[PDB]
Amino acid sequence: TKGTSSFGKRRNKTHTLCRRCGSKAYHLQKSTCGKCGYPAKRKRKYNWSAKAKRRNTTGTGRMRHLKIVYRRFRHGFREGTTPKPK
Amino acid sequence: AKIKARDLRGKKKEELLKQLDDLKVELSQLRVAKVTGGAASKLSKIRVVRKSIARVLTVINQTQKENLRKFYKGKKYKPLDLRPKKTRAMRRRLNKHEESLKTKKQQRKERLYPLRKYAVKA
Amino acid sequence: MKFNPFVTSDRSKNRKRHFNAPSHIRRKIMSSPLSKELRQKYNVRSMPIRKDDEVQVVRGHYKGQQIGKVVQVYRKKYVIYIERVQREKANGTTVHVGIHPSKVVITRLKLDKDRKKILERKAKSRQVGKEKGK
Amino acid sequence: SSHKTFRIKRFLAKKQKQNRPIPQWIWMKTGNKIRYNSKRRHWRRTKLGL
Amino acid sequence: APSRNGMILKPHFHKDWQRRVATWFNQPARKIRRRKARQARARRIAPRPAAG
Amino acid sequence: NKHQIKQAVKKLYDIDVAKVNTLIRPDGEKKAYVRLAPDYDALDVANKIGII
RNA sequence: CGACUCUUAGCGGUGGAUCACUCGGCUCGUGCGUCGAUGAAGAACGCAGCUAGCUGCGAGAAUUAAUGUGAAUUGCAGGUUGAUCAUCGACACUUCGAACGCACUUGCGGCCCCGGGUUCCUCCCGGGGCUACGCCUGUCUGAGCGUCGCU
RNA sequence: UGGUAGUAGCAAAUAUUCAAACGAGAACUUUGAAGGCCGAAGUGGAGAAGGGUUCCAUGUGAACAGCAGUUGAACAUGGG
RNA sequence: GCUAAAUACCGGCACGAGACCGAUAGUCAACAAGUACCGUAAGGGAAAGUUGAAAAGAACUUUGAAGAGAGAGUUCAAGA
RNA sequence: CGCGACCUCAGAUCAGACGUGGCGACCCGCUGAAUUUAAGCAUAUUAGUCAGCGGAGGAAAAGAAACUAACCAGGAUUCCCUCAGUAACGGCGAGUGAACAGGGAAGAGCCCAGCGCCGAAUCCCCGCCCCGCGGCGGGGCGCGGGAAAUGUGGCGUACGGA
Ligand SMILES: [Mg+2]
Ligand SMILES: [Mg+2]
Ligand SMILES: [Mg+2]
Ligand SMILES: [Mg+2]
Ligand SMILES: [Mg+2]
Ligand SMILES: [Mg+2]
Ligand SMILES: [Mg+2]
Ligand SMILES: [Mg+2]
Ligand SMILES: [Mg+2]
Ligand SMILES: [Mg+2]
Ligand SMILES: [Mg+2]
Ligand SMILES: [Mg+2]
Ligand SMILES: [Mg+2]
Ligand SMILES: [Mg+2]
Ligand SMILES: [Mg+2]
Ligand SMILES: [Mg+2]
Ligand SMILES: [Mg+2]
Ligand SMILES: [Mg+2]
Ligand SMILES: [Mg+2]
Ligand SMILES: [Mg+2]
Ligand SMILES: [Mg+2]
Ligand SMILES: [Mg+2]
Ligand SMILES: [Mg+2]
Ligand SMILES: [Mg+2]
Ligand SMILES: [Mg+2]
Ligand SMILES: [Mg+2]
Ligand SMILES: [Mg+2]
Ligand SMILES: [Mg+2]
Ligand SMILES: [Mg+2]
Ligand SMILES: [Mg+2]
Ligand SMILES: [Mg+2]
Ligand SMILES: [Mg+2]
Ligand SMILES: [Mg+2]
Ligand SMILES: [Mg+2]
Ligand SMILES: [Mg+2]
Ligand SMILES: [Mg+2]
Ligand SMILES: [Mg+2]
Ligand SMILES: [Mg+2]
Ligand SMILES: [Mg+2]
Ligand SMILES: [Mg+2]
Ligand SMILES: [Mg+2]
Ligand SMILES: [Zn+2]
């Protein structure tokens, strides 16, 4: 009964979706995330999995504010000035 | 017709508000027409009304914030949103006045021994 | 040969910049040469194609001396449609055949306030260039 | 489960709205290579995770 | 397995030397950069000797 | 909220609201049933706001 | 003759090998070399007339304002005193997330000020602004059979 | 991509028959009749976990439901 | 206790080039790719480019319910 | 008993600020193996390397001798060639392995504590007025508040200084 019959008792999930990383790895009993460590203030990151690091980096997602900062840099972060009107 | 922002800035706040609500009413009834199922004229006009609403809100916000910073132009402590939003490192950087401050020791050192302009014959 | 190190000579990059150019660059790229009368009048060799210009066809199956007005400028396909350069479909409906602006000669310009100032600027630039030559 | 949480129900809502087929007018575009929606999900083949 | 006759060698390649190797493919570029900085310095101090 | 829906309907259409029952559809949007006061008639309100 | 099997050729079925194309990679080099509590990276959810993915965007939601340019976008409808694109310095930018009123079900609060009730008389509803830890300077409130001076 | 090979097999839990209807086509859908089974610790009626639109109606029969299907927990439209 | 310069750069922005690779090659990824998909999780992780100059994407007739054929027509070419 | 100071420690949704986290190719500090080699293997080797943790910058670190030399002496730090696969370390086995001088790139020097001398001659904050303010500063008025004598500022630091 080690195999197929044992597989019939899968009816209570262990992990749920994390509210920080978005992956389904937030352990309920441990109350911690196995993908990014949500309760820990520092993002889980190890150098022995380069692929895992690359899957979620600075350039992976939207870069909602950073890409705006990139195009502001080429003008030197101007503030308070507008082009002359017609 | 085609509402544009050039003639909206001169309008006062209450008139802009009493135009914005009418735009909201027209957008709502256009949405009702879309759900019921009508001609493509209302469907096309939905985008126009939404952009007109966006442009009116933009003008209202620009005038409001311009008046706010005009009010806080001369004061020493100004609200954070009105403060210049540059990079965090640049804000934490010392200002030109502080970085230009020079102690009396190096002031008199430069006084007594300035960098001269010299040349040597071949 | 080109000497500016900030201008590409790579085939792949040039093709990418051509097939992904924005519409305001598509307008400048899709420019047609002016007629001999037009160039000797306005001193301009070529101009961007517009919606309401009378043009001919120089190369292709529809080439000839007949004059037709453009009806629309389909800049997405690098194509313009002419007044009577068209063919029938299977069902009998007539649809225009795309013609590249490179094989189109402008006969009469639909000059406007902006069109006139563009021509004057181009004429001025080429006149000062010729004067600088000698 | 009939006792769905708000976040899970919202997640299922998005997946259901994503599961609809591609409209028939899109594949008439010029720069189009989408012959069909390849990311369709069926409740008997893929269990969506969770 | 040494051959019949020859030197005994002790190469220092037993570490992971490939991970830390410096290549001089930027040598002419660095020469030009030094030259441009040197000329820029020379024109900055207009009457002063270039060598300092 | 149900109170917000009741107040919004009252201000937008000048009709008294008896009660509100709200559910969230499987598509994500919230469907709200607005039971009006006995004086008003839903048929008249519907045909004067557009839906018919 | 016939049927079947074997060898070759023609043609017809797979199957995409070779060849030619390449808006893609790899490498070298150059200049620059900037994230974040004024809320980063990331994640979630939404936004198109017809829209799934991608891309873009954030309730102003395939974008607003301004500037440059100057007659389009386009798969189908619809409507020069500036359509579309590019630039982008003004405005705005939902929910989690170092995430910050407590925990993470999105529940339960507290304080102050407004609008509905009242006509401040207390509830109740809606709206607006604060309530995370550590830590520097100053301010206030303090405590000590700590050191004191006077009665 | 071949020989195997149109082969192995499509044999756990008694069982189907008749007439009509739609339909181009029926051993398989629907109706009616008959004969049966589960036999109230059920092949019944309702929950929790789990799944997430599989629930309902119409249309299609391209692909799947190891035969076929006028049927579907299939596909497309709209609801709930 | 402070201090530029010459020095390092496989992260990032914008660039130029190649005695390199040419879709089983080259980054895993030339395409809706760290996507689909599997594992509870850490993680693992693909296949997949070529109509035509222009869709001009085959009007119309004929058998069949249709898949799909026989004519006809577009194209220099449907032996695209 | 009380009042008023000083000192140590609290509470503040007190006024004004700062740190939190991310990328992490390059850099700084710490921790840190086993594969492998030695034809086995324990010292060694792999190796101050991988893995792990912390902290930044546009570069970082280092840096102006408690130096190198023993010559007729040089003179901050850093990087290239060379010294050199050398001195040297090593079950003296496998193997490991610098530095000085020399030629270049660059080249820039300095500041406190202490000893002292000047009425704390110093500095911070809040109120008001003027000027420009999208790197909140300059001038003036406050018997305004505070820090500081348990030491601020000027002269001044090994090359002498007063
Ligand atoms: Mg468990
Ligand atoms: Mg870490
Ligand atoms: Mg001093
Ligand atoms: Mg040039
Ligand atoms: Mg031998
Ligand atoms: Mg020199
Ligand atoms: Mg930085
Ligand atoms: Mg949508
Ligand atoms: Mg605009
Ligand atoms: Mg404009
Ligand atoms: Mg609970
Ligand atoms: Mg058989
Ligand atoms: Mg069976
Ligand atoms: Mg039941
Ligand atoms: Mg059903
Ligand atoms: Mg079957
Ligand atoms: Mg230092
Ligand atoms: Mg070259
Ligand atoms: Mg391929
Ligand atoms: Mg091939
Ligand atoms: Mg490949
Ligand atoms: Mg292939
Ligand atoms: Mg092919
Ligand atoms: Mg091929
Ligand atoms: Mg041929
Ligand atoms: Mg061919
Ligand atoms: Mg405070
Ligand atoms: Mg940090
Ligand atoms: Mg060994
Ligand atoms: Mg061995
Ligand atoms: Mg051994
Ligand atoms: Mg050792
Ligand atoms: Mg060691
Ligand atoms: Mg060590
Ligand atoms: Mg490491
Ligand atoms: Mg430093
Ligand atoms: Mg010294
Ligand atoms: Mg030295
Ligand atoms: Mg060693
Ligand atoms: Mg030396
Ligand atoms: Mg002193
Ligand atoms: Zn997580």
Can you walk me through this structure?
- This is part of a larger assembly, with chains A (86 residues), B (122 residues), C (134 residues), D (50 residues), E (52 residues) and F (52 residues).
- Chain A contains two helices and three strands.
- Chain A has helices at 50-55, 66-73; strands spanning 15-17, 24-27, 32-33.
- Chain A has a three-stranded antiparallel beta sheet, with no helix packed on it.
- The termini of chain A are far apart.
- By secondary structure, chain B is an all-alpha fold.
- Helices cover 61% and strands 0% of the residues of chain B.
- Chain B has helices spanning 13-36, 40-71, 88-92, 96-100, 104-112.
- Chain B is elongated, with a radius of gyration of 29 Å.
- With 134 residues, chain C is of the alpha+beta class.
- Chain D is an all-alpha fold and 50 residues long.
- Chain D contains one helix and no strands.
- The longest helix of chain D is centred in the N-terminal third of the chain and has 13 residues, at 6-18.
- Chain D is elongated, with a radius of gyration of 15 Å.
- Chains in contact: A-B, A-D, B-E, B-F, D-F.
- Chain B binds chain F through residues 28-29, 32-33, 35-36, and chain F through 12, 49-52.
- Chain B binds four RNA strands through residues 2, 4-6, 34, 39-48, 50-51, 53-62, 64-66, 69, 73-99, 103-106.
Keywords:
part of a larger assembly, 6 chains, B: 122 residues, mainly alpha, 61% helix, 0% strand, E: 52 residues, 1 helix, binds magnesium ion, binds zinc ion, RNA-binding, Large ribosomal subunit protein uL24 (chain C), ribonucleoprotein (chain C), cytoplasm (chain C)
Summarize the structure.
The structure is cut from a larger assembly and holds chains A (86 residues), B (122 residues), C (134 residues), D (50 residues), E (52 residues) and F (52 residues). Chain A is α+β, with helices and mostly antiparallel strands and 86 residues long. In chain A, 16% of the residues lie in helices and 10% in strands.
Write the element-wise H/E pattern of chain B from the N-terminal end onward. Answer: HHHHH
**Quantity of strands of chain D, as a count:** 0
| N-to-C span of chain B | 81 Å
Most strands sheet of chain B: none
Q: Please estimate the helix content of chain D.
A: 25-40%
- Estimated radius of gyration of chain D: 15 Å
What kind of oligomer do you see?
part of a larger assembly
Shape of chain D: elongated
Total number of helical segments of chain D? 1
Tell me the number of helical segments of chain B per DSSP (H or I, 4 or more residues long): 5
By helix and strand content of chain B, what is the structural category? mainly alpha
